[PDB]
Amino acid sequence: NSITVRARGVNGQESVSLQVGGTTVQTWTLTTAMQDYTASTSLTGEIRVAFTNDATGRDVQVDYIVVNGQTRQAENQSVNTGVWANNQCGGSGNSEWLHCNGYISFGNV
Ligand SMILES: OC[C@H]1O[C@@H](O[C@H]2[C@H](O)[C@@H](O)[C@H](O)O[C@@H]2CO)[C@H](O)[C@@H](O)[C@@H]1O
Numbered sequence: 001n002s003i004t005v006r007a008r009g010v011n012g013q014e015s016v017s018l019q020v021g022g023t024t025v026q027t028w029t030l031t032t033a034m035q036d037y038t039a040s041t042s043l044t045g046e047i048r049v050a051f052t053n054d055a056t057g058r059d060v061q062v063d064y065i066v067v068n069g070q071t072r073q074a075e076n077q078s079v080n081t082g083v084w085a086n087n088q089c090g091g092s093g094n095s096e097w098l099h100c101n102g103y104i105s106f107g108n109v
Pocket residue numbers: 054055056058059084099100101
């Protein structure tokens with residue numbers, strides 16, 4: 001499988017991990033502009049994009065991923081454990097943003 005993540009940080013120090021079934025497939029440091037990050041995997045389970053180094057000044061915006069050619073918008077995903085919403089991390093779904101450490105789930109490969 002081929003997976004492309006389109007994402008940015010706000011300050012350029014942010015780290016994200018592409019995970020499949022809980023296995024980290026690849027980690028990247030983001031820049032302050034949307035860019036594409038691509039990895040391959042034989043794994044087939046639940047895809048997550050996780051922000052792992054939250055700190056002052058650091059937040060992640062994930063536009064979408066592409067899975068074997070299918071674009072899956074971050075904001076179309078019901079599960080986002082990092083968005084700051086309703087005064088808490090993970091207070092709602094359907095967001096591009098990871099403010100807190102947490103992940104967006106994009107369903108199975
Ligand atoms: O401190 C909890 C959490 O805050 C996040 O920023 C929030 C902020 O707390 C809130 O006052 C403001 O209006 O919303 C922002 C998010 O947009 C911060 O991004 C997290 O790193 C931090 O854990």
